[PDB]
Amino acid sequence: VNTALQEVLKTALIHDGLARGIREAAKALDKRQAHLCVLASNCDEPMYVKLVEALCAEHQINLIKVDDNKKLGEWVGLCKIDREGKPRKVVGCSCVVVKDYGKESQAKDVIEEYFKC
Amino acid sequence: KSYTTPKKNKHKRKKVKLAVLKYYKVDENGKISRLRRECPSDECGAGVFMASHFDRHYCGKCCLTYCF
Ligand SMILES: [Zn+2]
Question: Which of A22, A23, A55 is the closest to B32 by Cβ?
Answer without folding.
Answer: A55
